[PDB]
């Protein structure tokens, strides 16, 4: 599913993402926008054999099992195909687990690049959340 920006803001807010591990909601909408253009089915294969999955582009080397990634650890304990459903529950649970690591949301290159230190008010503007 390709989410509407505000539809996604509402689903993240309903799922407790607003302030999770200290990351306010605009952070999560900005990252989703630059990592997948709000498309839960986005996939991106990497030079290292790993693949990025879903709306949050979670990588198969450490968080999910796609069965074709060398030296994979599956910390979220899921199949990477569960990160591509229209229903965001498993993606949100795994993203929540990713930001508890020491690097926090800095784990996402798109966040470091386009959201870190920026005004992110536009990302939640007009969502009434």
UniProtKB/Swiss-Prot annotation:
GO biological process: defense response to Gram-negative bacterium; defense response to Gram-positive bacterium; killing of cells of another organism
Temperature dependence, free-text field: Optimum temperature is 33-49 degrees Celsius. Retains 25% of its maximal activity after heating 10 minutes at 80 degrees Celsius.
Top-rank lineage group of the source organism: Eukaryota
Protein name: Lysozyme C II
Keyword annotations of the record: Antibiotic, Antimicrobial, Bacteriolytic enzyme, Disulfide bond, Glycosidase, Hydrolase, Secreted, Signal
Disulfide bonds: 6-127, 30-115, 64-80, 76-94
Gene Ontology CC terms, in alphabetical order: extracellular space
Catalytic activity of the protein: Hydrolysis of (1->4)-beta-linkages between N-acetylmuramic acid and N-acetyl-D-glucosamine residues in a peptidoglycan and between N-acetyl-D-glucosamine residues in chitodextrins
Organism: Oncorhynchus mykiss
PROSITE patterns listed in its UniProt record: GLYCOSYL_HYDROL_F22_1, GLYCOSYL_HYDROL_F22_2
Assigned protein family: Belongs to the glycosyl hydrolase 22 family.
The EC number(s) this enzyme carries: 3.2.1.17
C-type lysozyme domain residues: 1-129
Any one Pfam family match given in the protein's UniProt record, by short name: Lys
Primary subcellular site in the record, as a coarse category: secreted
Functional note: Lysozymes have primarily a bacteriolytic function; those in tissues and body fluids are associated with the monocyte-macrophage system and enhance the activity of immunoagents. Has antibacterial activity against the Gram positive bacterium P.citreus. Has no antibacterial activity against the Gram negative bacteria E.coli and Y.ruckeri. Does not have hemolytic activity against trout erythrocytes.
Compartment(s) of residence: Secreted
Gene Ontology molecular-function annotations: lysozyme activity
Source species taxonomy: Eukaryota, Metazoa, Chordata, Craniata, Vertebrata
Influence of pH: Optimum pH is 4.5-5.5. No activity above pH 8.8.
Residues at the catalytic site: 35, 52
